[PDB]
Amino acid sequence: ISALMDKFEHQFETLDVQTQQMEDTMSSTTTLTTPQNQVDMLLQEMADEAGLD
């Protein structure tokens, strides 16, 4: 059992790195459609007036 469990840790650890990698290429391919600057000014836009409604 214990062996099966450290095997478990290692296993889903590899899951997480798979995830991370995938999301890097996946978010660097469509990245033309989400500038950094635009998001900055947006988040700021909804920052200053955030709770003012």
């Binding site: 459609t33 989400t34 500038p35 635009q38």
Partner: protein, 53 residues
């Protein structure tokens, strides 16, 4: 979502334009065929109906 809105909507524009010109092409086609039709029927009916008779 917003930049996608721009991109898609742009495609909608240009594709719509080609759609229009294709429309013109088809209707032009119909007119051409039908016109050929009247020129011919009227011609073969202009041979036995020739003005002297």
């Amino acid at each position: 979502q917003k930049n996608q809105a721009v991109n898609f909507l742009r495609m909608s524009a240009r594709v719509d334009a080609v759609a229009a010109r294709v429309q013109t092409a088809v209707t032009m086609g119909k007119v051409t065929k039908s016109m050929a039709g009247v020129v011919k029927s009227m011609d073969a009916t202009l041979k036995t109906m020739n003005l002297e008779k």
